[PDB]
């Protein structure tokens, strides 16, 4: 109950116009939850872009154990053609529990935490199928029907921890396999930081090579600054005197923390994200009082969509960044913050 599924179905919903095909694999969930998810995907335009693969909690352990592999085989059809697919494996840990049931019923020797020893080979052979293949591999597979196109399969597995304890056997295996993790945690979620992404223990091992240049330029500063703000906020917590570098840091970090909260089912385009991050990096938030920062962002997106939509089209299509882009964004922030009201 920290928003694990919410993040992944919003990542599906947002692909509705990106051209990336989607697969959602539901392992061991109750069937009425899969009704509700499909009903949200159909309330947006997302379901017509999506495949849904189900093994509910009633179905046999063999069906649950195979369900991730069946989903990957569907995603590989798009990957070997030169099309992009995004596959979500909801609760890989329920796949491991089904695999443990199978192994103990077959009387195979229990290893640690009673899982079989091969359980690493279960998840690692699954997840290494998600790959980007070079154009030559596509041409060979398609026998020359498709030429010059690179296909990709992107996997977003989900793991549930029992108490933040990452040391359990199934979490330690999947953390070893993947190209990064996003940690969602209960203390942030109860504090109202939603999405509850912990900036410190989350990391992407691909990093900036995945971003558009505008986001790459703005976002690189954000995550490591925000982590040190949390250390600084701990060290500061009883000291009456702050030096102004520290006092500035102890404010900027609160306003960035407030800025990254976002409502469910409300995805933002690249230009909309870039504009709001530009307001934080180039200091335009600094005087605005913190609860107004939420209204400041809403009013800024509204203002820019009526008055400056040609730039939003330029940034969304290109992802480009230049001195004239910095100049036009500066002019928009200067103009918004003078003319409008939060």
């Amino acid at each position: 109950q920290t928003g694990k599924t919410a993040l992944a179905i919003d990542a599906i919903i947002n692909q509705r116009d990106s051209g990336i095909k989607a697969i959602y694999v539901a392992i061991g969930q109750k069937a009425s939850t899969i009704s509700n998810v499909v009903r949200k995907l159909e309330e947006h335009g997302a379901l017509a872009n999506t495949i849904v693969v189900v093994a509910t909690a009633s179905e046999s352990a063999a069906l649950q154990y195979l369900a991730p592999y069946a989903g990957a085989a569907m995603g590989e059809y798009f990957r070997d053609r030169g099309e992009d697919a995004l596959i979500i494996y909801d609760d890989l840990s329920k796949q491991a529990v089904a695999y443990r049931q199978i192994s103990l019923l077959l009387r195979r020797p229990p290893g640690r935490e009673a899982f079989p020893g091969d359980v690493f080979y279960l998840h690692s052979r699954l997840l290494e199928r998600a790959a980007r293949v070079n154009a030559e591999y596509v041409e060979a597979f398609t026998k020359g029907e498709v030429k010059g196109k690179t296909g990709s399969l992107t996997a977003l597995p989900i793991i549930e921890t029992q108490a933040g304890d990452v040391s359990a056997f199934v979490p330690t295996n999947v953390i070893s396999i993947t190209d990064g993790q996003i940690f969602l945690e209960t203390n942030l979620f109860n504090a109202g930081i939603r999405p509850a992404v912990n900036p410190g223990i989350s990391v992407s091992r691909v990093g900036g090579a995945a971003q558009t240049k505008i986001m790459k330029k703005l976002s690189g500063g954000i995550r490591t600054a925000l982590a040190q703000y949390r250390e600084l906020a701990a060290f500061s917590q009883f000291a009456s005197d702050l030096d102004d570098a520290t006092r500035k840091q102890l404010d900027h970090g609160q306003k960035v923390t407030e800025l990254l909260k976002q409502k469910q089912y409300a995805p933002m385009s690249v230009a909309q994200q870039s504009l709001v991050l530009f307001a934080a990096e180039r200091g335009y938030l600094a005087d605005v009082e913190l609860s107004k920062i939420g209204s400041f962002e809403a009013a800024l997106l509204a203002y820019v969509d009526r008055d400056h939509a040609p730039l939003m089209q330029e940034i969304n299509q290109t992802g480009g960044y230049n001195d004239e882009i910095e100049g036009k964004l500066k002019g928009i922030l200067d103009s918004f913050k003078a003319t409008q009201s939060w």
Binding site: N187, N190, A191, G192, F238
Partner: protein, 115 residues
């Protein structure tokens, strides 16, 4: 969820959740140092959170054989109004005991008159 409950209920529940979370974050300070070391806003979070924890209590009709005091049924309109009023601080002049085991927020102010 705001769509099904609507916003006033959703905002009240998330406010209560945020104040009570922050009270958990302060309790390890309070446990060693005592409360006097807190900031004057941190003391106000504690002073509200403790009232909220009491107002969550309620007399049940089936529990009369234990508590003796008579059971209460509380409407959803009265519950969101009570917690929203406490978090707005309308009731920061009442003691904590005023909120314990009272059906509705009106019953708290009548209990407060006799402490």
């Amino acid at each position: 969820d705001p769509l099904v409950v609507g916003q006033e209920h959703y905002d009240t529940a998330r406010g209560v959740q945020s104040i009570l979370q922050r009270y958990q974050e302060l309790k390890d300070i309070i446990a060693i140092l005592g409360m006097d070391e807190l900031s004057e806003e941190d003391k106000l979070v504690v002073a509200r959170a403790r009232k909220i924890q009491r107002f969550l209590s309620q007399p049940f009709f089936v529990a009369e054989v234990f508590t003796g005091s008579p059971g209460k049924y509380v409407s959803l309109k009265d519950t969101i109004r009570g917690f929203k009023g406490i978090m707005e601080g309308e009731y920061d002049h009442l003691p904590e005991q005023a909120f314990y085991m009272v059906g509705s927020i009106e019953e708290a102010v009548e209990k407060a008159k006799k402490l």
